[model samples]
Target: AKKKVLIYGAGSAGLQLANMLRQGKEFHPIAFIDDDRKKHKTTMQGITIYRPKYLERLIKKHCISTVLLAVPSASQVQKKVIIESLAKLHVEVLTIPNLDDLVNGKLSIGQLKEVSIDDLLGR
Candidate 1:
């Protein structure tokens, strides 16, 4: 069975990643996490949007095994906080390069890489 995934961020980058995953058979995106209160409880592309604090509940309810950080524009501090929160859950974390670093500002699922200590450290 494909591993269930939760996308951390519900902006353009997150939406794009969700679409890419939909076209493949690898990870299955179950929900999206965004701090935007306006986006909370809304659905995009059939995936429900949730707040960061709801992560624990969502993970357990959906049996999510992976979390994809798709907020390319997020601040280093913000990223670190989210990473640390997920660490407590023992789920695998992955991330894509910043949008500015992407080739022609385009994202490809192949560009996703496992989160490293340097990433959390903002190195």
Candidate 2:
């Protein structure tokens, strides 16, 4: 069964994840939500792009409780607001590993970890 997942970010890493997710075929990315209004209403690899505010409603429509935060280069402040959004819905937040891990080709869906603002702010 494909687990329903939501994608956040429509940049480089987001597209990269899109390919991997499609290849893996183990998860369904219901949509992509980005901060850039210009990217809104666009479609990437068949998934529709939406604004941040659309999340709450999407959860109902897709019945998804997982969000993949692929914005690896976004600022901590930018990260905060989005992470905060998930907190309200109590959605589990997930992120890609470090560039070092990606470059080393040490990738595993099993190794992806949960993201929390505490880890970001504590650093």
Candidate 3:
């Protein structure tokens, strides 16, 4: 069966991944979810952008097998938090190499990383 994918970020990596996936048919992206609440329900790059809260609904509806992680702006701590939460959902997660390298660092929300967190965690 072709794997159904849910893009976890609306940024370049996740969007471009959808294009790459089309050629192989190994996976197909059904929806995009971003931390940006304003983008929710808006169609971006020809796909609907869902709010973070809708992840479970999207998964159950589309049968998402893997969540492609492309949120470079999301620091290690945030990534882990999301990954940890997703772990409970039982879907396979695909991540970038840096995700592992950051783990080796034992995870740090350094001034640089902390800055990244502040940037995204803004209310």
Candidate 4:
């Protein structure tokens, strides 16, 4: 079975990652989480967009085993906050490189790296 993945962020980077994953064999995106209130309860590319607070329930409902942080342009403080929140849920978390690198062709959507302590520390 494909691993159920929840993508954090609903912007261009996140949408691109979801599209790529949809064509891959390893992971399947279940939904998107974004802080933007206007995007809440909306659907994009057939995937639902939810608020961050819905994570716990969504995880159980969808059997989400992984979360992908696609908000590459988010500040270090924002990244740390989200990472810490996911950590409490005990789910495997991964992240893509910054948008600049991605746009510059320095990294591909498939080049996701697992999140680590140092990453959360913003070091």
User: Candidate 3's residue-wise lDDT over 17-58, tens digit each?
Assistant: 667665565777789889888888988667899888998999
Model 4 residue 61 CA deviation in Å: 0.9
Best model number under TM-score: 4
- Please report, in order, the local distance difference test score of every candidate based on alpha carbons: 0.85, 0.79, 0.69, 0.89
Candidate 4 matches the true fold with a TM-score of 0.93
In candidate 1, how many Å is residue 10 off? 0.4
Best by lDDT: 4
Of 1 and 4, the candidate ahead on lDDT is 4
Rank order (by lDDT, best first): 4, 1, 2, 3
Q: Give one digit per residue, the lDDT tens place, for model 1 in 96-120.
A: 8866676575756447888887654
Please provide, for model 4 over 37-96, each residue's C-alpha lDDT reduced to its tens digit, 9 standing for 90 to 100.
899999999999999989999999988878999998899788889998888887888998
Give the root-mean-square deviation of each candidate in angstroms.
2.2, 2.9, 8.9, 1.6
The predicted structure with the larger lDDT, 2 or 4, is 4
Worst 10 residues of 4 by lDDT: 114-123
Better of 1 and 2 by TM-score: 1
Off by over 4 Å in 1: 103-110, 118-123
Model 3 TM-score on a 0 to 1 scale: 0.74
lDDT per residue as tens, model 2, 21-123: 8677677788998999999889988888999889999988889988888886778777777787786786788887755576667874334578856843334
- Which candidate would rank higher by lDDT, 3 or 4? 4
Model with the higher TM-score, candidate 1 or 3: 1
Kindly indicate the candidate among 2 and 3 with the higher TM-score: 2
